[PDB]
Design a protein around this ligand. Structure first.
Ligand SMILES: CC(C)CCC[C@@H](C)[C@H]1CC[C@H]2[C@@H]3CC=C4C[C@@H](OC(=O)CCC(=O)O)CC[C@]4(C)[C@H]3CC[C@]12C
Ligand SMILES: CC(C)CCC[C@@H](C)[C@H]1CC[C@H]2[C@@H]3CC=C4C[C@@H](OC(=O)CCC(=O)O)CC[C@]4(C)[C@H]3CC[C@]12C
Ligand SMILES: CCCCCCCCCC(=O)N(CCO)C[C@@H](O)[C@@H](O)[C@@H](O)[C@@H](O)CO
Ligand SMILES: CCCCCCCCCC(=O)N(CCO)C[C@@H](O)[C@@H](O)[C@@H](O)[C@@H](O)CO
Ligand SMILES: CCCCCCCCCC(=O)N(CCO)C[C@@H](O)[C@@H](O)[C@@H](O)[C@@H](O)CO
Ligand SMILES: CCCCCCCCCC(=O)N(CCO)C[C@@H](O)[C@@H](O)[C@@H](O)[C@@H](O)CO
Ligand SMILES: C[C@H](CCc1ccc(O)cc1)NCCc1ccc(O)c(O)c1
Ligand code: NA
Length: 286
């Protein structure tokens, strides 16, 4: 009874600590490799740095908070931090998928008008693009949350909003659909649509240089595909639950959210496809 709980708490505390360490170490390595290797300071890698910041925030704030909730079975931190934590969760996933759209659009431009690209894309514009993405993402995530537009009137829901040990994200139907569409489904459709024209135009292209470029492209495609596989299950279930809760078991819904958090560990591993990253990772790890 109490032993079963101690076994589970200690083992789960260790797994969680591992997850945190893998997300934080991996994304610090990405940022530090790009921030200290001139060869990696391309405009595209500025967008990768943005993505690695989203993941880093997941590692430092989102996951540790969720960990205390999984290990201890209740929300220990009070109402404000529950709401902030929820905000940072919505923020990070929104910023991630919006950044992946920008990355897809950047490559589309570079591949179809190399010259217009050259004279349009500057470091100063890349910065504005990145801040614009975070501004929109901030807007879409914080405001409806801090303004309580996600709240429901259901007796279960009010039960939780009254309990300071409860931080379930129990939302009304309107918010679930809307935030899903605005945070996820619309950017997903854009990214897929653009990534496909990228594929088409890449196939419509000395040989060594085109191969190195297509390897990098494929890396970006893998980033985009893994992200979709890690988060789509949760957002599918998020919709389906709006119509009929029973059709998908609860434990699964929380697992799918954790699948989403876990994506924050994956990119640094995926970047090891690149000789340049691999070299800088080795050099940095000393
Ligand atoms: C608790 C949460 C809400 C923190 C959110 C932090 C954001 C405001 C971060 C996340 C991504 C960061 C950006 C990621 C990348 C860049 C590129 C960077 O370009 C450079 O001039 C130097 C980088 C290089 O060339 O190696 C300028 C800062 C900026 C816009 C960063 C500014 C701060 C941003 C938007
Ligand atoms: C809220 C959801 C439904 C919108 C998701 C769409 C975004 C993922 C993408 C699609 C097109 C992107 C935009 C395409 C072009 C630009 C221009 C870009 O560059 C500049 O304006 C710099 C120009 C300068 O000041 O010199 C600023 C970012 C922005 C708005 C991008 C921000 C992100 C957008 C809106
Ligand atoms: C939760 C994240 C939310 C991100 C907030 C984004 C706000 C919009 C971006 C913005 O305000 N700037 C673009 C950023 O480049 C202005 C900056 O340029 C600013 O620092 C200026 O005061 C300097 O340019 C003065 O030299
Ligand atoms: C970018 C996302 C922005 C989403 C904005 C959604 C705001 C929707 C407001 C709203 O619909 N409610 C108030 C919330 O402020 C209440 C109802 O949704 C609900 O509580 C009850 O009427 C139930 O009985 C279900 O019909
Ligand atoms: C496109 C805008 C249509 C609005 C979509 C709202 C979906 C609400 C459907 C719903 O609540 N149920 C599905 C009913 O089949 C379950 C109810 O029966 C219980 O309250
Ligand atoms: C309170 C109820 C929620 C309890 C469910 C918590 C699951 C623990 C989350 C976790 O860290 N992982 C399981 C994910 O659920 C391990 C991740 O590292 C994993 O996602 C990937 O590395 C694998 O897919 C590779 O096989
Ligand atoms: C913070 C919240 C809770 C996740 C959670 C809950 C319990 C746990 O034990 C572990 C994780 N997740 C929000 C996910 C979300 C992200 C984006 C959206 O648009 C949306 O509607 C919902
Ligand atoms: Na509560």
């Amino acid at each position: 009874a109490e032993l079963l709980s101690q076994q589970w708490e200690a083992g789960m505390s260790l797994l969680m600590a591992l997850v945190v360490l893998l997300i934080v170490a991996g994304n610090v390595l990405v940022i530090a490799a790009i921030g200290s290797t001139q060869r990696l300071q391309t405009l595209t890698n500025l967008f990768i740095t943005s993505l690695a910041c989203a993941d880093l925030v997941v590692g430092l704030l989102v996951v540790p908070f969720g960990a205390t909730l999984v290990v201890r079975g209740t929300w220990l931190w009070g109402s404000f931090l529950c709401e902030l934590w929820t905000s940072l969760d919505v923020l990070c996933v929104t910023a991630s998928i919006e950044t992946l759209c920008v990355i897809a659009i950047d490559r589309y431009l570079a591949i179809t008008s190399p010259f217009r690209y050259q004279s349009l894309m500057t470091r100063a514009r890349a910065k504005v693009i990145i801040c614009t993405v975070w501004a929109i993402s901030a807007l879409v995530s914080f405001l409806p949350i801090m303004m309580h537009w996600w709240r429901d009137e259901d007796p279960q829901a009010l039960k939780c909003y009254q309990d300071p040990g409860c931080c379930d994200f129990v939302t009304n139907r309107a918010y679930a659909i809307a935030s899903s569409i605005i945070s996820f489904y619309i950017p997903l459709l854009i990214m897929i649509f653009v990534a496909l024209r990228v594929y088409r135009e890449a196939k419509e292209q000395s040989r060594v240089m085109l191969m190195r470029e297509h390897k990098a492209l494929k890396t970006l495609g893998i980033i985009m595909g893994v992200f979709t596989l890690c988060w789509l299950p949760f957002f599918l279930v998020n919709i389906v639950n709006v119509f009929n809760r029973d059709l998908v078991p609860d434990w699964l819904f929380v697992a799918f959210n954790w699948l989403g958090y876990a994506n924050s560990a994956m990119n640094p591993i995926i970047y090891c496809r690149s000789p340049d990253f691999r070299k800088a990772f080795k050099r940095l790890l000393a």
